[PDB]
Amino acid sequence: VPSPKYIEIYQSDFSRNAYPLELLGGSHVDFAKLLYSFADQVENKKFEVYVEDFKKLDSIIAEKGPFWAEEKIFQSPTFQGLSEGFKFILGWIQSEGAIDRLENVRLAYKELVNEARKETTATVIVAKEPSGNDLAEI
């Protein structure tokens, strides 16, 4: 199933290439750099595709529980909506057992996104409900 573009990129080196940012981390930097390299090269800088996969996966886990690392990510009824490159990288993480380090991947792909697009975000956690006076005062 996995497309040869991902196999060629994978067996080739990617970390030494030019990126928007020198990323700090151990092994988990590669899983995000490879997502960024697919989004930049083959999908033509459609970064939010993989950002949706995380938003997809956050619900998929609620449909299966935390015992989703066991499952081969290619063959599955629930993973059908996922991107092939994202599936390949979840499979690589399944092989290496780094799947417990997931959120450190999305947090880094978000950095590369926010720097390539140059979109620094600023989260807000205000009140038990929002309001109009403070939405314009804050």
DSSP structure class, residue 118: T
Residue 111: CB minimum distance to another protein, A? 6
Amino acid at 36: Y
123 interacts with another protein by CB under 8 A: no
74 interacts with another protein by CB under 8 A: yes
Among 44, 59, 80, 95, binds another protein (CB under 8 A): 95
Q: Alpha-carbon distance 94 to 91, whole Å?
A: 5
Cβ distance to another protein smaller for residue 39 or 108: 108
Cβ distance to another protein smaller for residue 32 or 39: 32
Please report, for residues 3, 94, 108, 131, the alpha-carbon distance to residue 90 in angstroms, rounded to integers and kept in the order given. Answer: 15, 6, 15, 40
Please report, for residues 12, 26, 61, the alpha-carbon distance to residue 56 in angstroms, rounded to integers and kept in the order given. Answer: 29, 26, 9
H or E segment and range at residue 49: helix 48-60
Among 25, 51, 99, 116, binds another protein (CB under 8 A): 25
11 interacts with another protein by CB under 8 A: yes
Residue 29: CB minimum distance to another protein, A? 8
